[model samples]
Target: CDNFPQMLRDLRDAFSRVKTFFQTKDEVDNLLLKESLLEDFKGYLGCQALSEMIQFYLEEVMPQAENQDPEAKDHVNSLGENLKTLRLRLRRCHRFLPCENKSKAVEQIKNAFNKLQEKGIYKAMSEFDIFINYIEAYMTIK
Candidate 1:
């Protein structure tokens, strides 16, 4: 059971559902997301890379975002809770799994968002669905 892959698929769908809220709340410029993140997950360290990305969302982005869409507290708590389940595993994988990537992929991503300082949180959240979309492709293949 590739339970990790299953979990991510579950999350991608839920976020796709609630995504209308985050993507719509955008009040910033149309800066595209990074491709390097996609590349990072192709290597042995992919698990760690995914963890960092998810951590960015659950830890920093989602918590800070004001929930405008009351309609979709819709299982997001379960979504959020399952996301926690993800951390439990991915966090452990770093020790059990092989790893090493010279690129600090998430750093550039954070820097791009940080440049805006105030609005980037929503900007990143807006791009989240796409982020999941990108990584999910690699998830099933590898």
Candidate 2:
């Protein structure tokens, strides 16, 4: 059970399920919540996991390059580029989600996102739960 790969799969599956729920449910509030959930679900997928073919290039094939292969260095540079792209994409998700309780959650999420920028993986993971709990608050409403 590789935690990183498992996390990526779970995040993708959760977003897909929530997207299906939105497509089938017509209620405005339910739609908003589901949309928010979908958006947040995507945020959990790190740049390390979701950036097209780039993640694989960086993590798997690139590291095998000898001494100081330029191709590997280029791939490493691409990872940084992809990470910046991911930061923007996740921020878009945060901006799009607006529930009554979204303000504080948004702030916490922004903090986590920024911490991620600062290379704080552990702190970011801790704050990830804040966003998760916020989404869960609406999800459990029956």
Candidate 3:
């Protein structure tokens, strides 16, 4: 169980490193290098589900939260609700599943997302213009 906590810490550290890089570099080449480093870290973790979740945050969740138009209450609510669905998915993985084989893990992830979507959790009501960019990048790479 000690390793579980350590793994969580390592994941958090990886994000912190990426977030720090985003803050410092003003050049595109440097940013690409940072993303490569982040991907390498995810590879080391050996968990496609975990890697996908991290990328989703970096590519989707954080951007939505940051670029939010405050005057748009309905939009924010929709985003917040979508965030809750994502939160549910991540929480399910963290609590129930072991982050191992990409093929199997991704299936589990897809199932979870599908279950939520079936419940109408994914359908945008107000159309916030900020939805998660679905990608299978983690499954293809190391």
Q: What is the TM-score of each candidate against the true structure?
A: 0.48, 0.24, 0.25
Using TM-score as the yardstick, the better of models 2 and 3 is: 3
Error of 3 at 7 (Å): 25
Pairs clashing in candidate 1? none
Per-model lDDT: 0.68, 0.48, 0.49
Q: Go through the candidates in order and give the clash count of each.
A: 0, 0, 0
Which candidate wins on TM-score?
1
lDDT of 3 at 59: 65
For 23-128, candidate 2 gives per-residue lDDT tens digits of 4544555332346444545764433234433445455544553225553454444444444444344445544222211467668867876766656667767678
Error of 3 at 50 (Å): 5.7
The alpha-carbon deviation from the true structure for residue 112 of candidate 3, after best TM-score superposition, in angstroms, is: 32
In model 1, which regions exceed 4 Å deviation? 2-5, 27-32, 66-76, 89-142
The 10-residue segment of model 2 with minimum total lDDT is 93-102
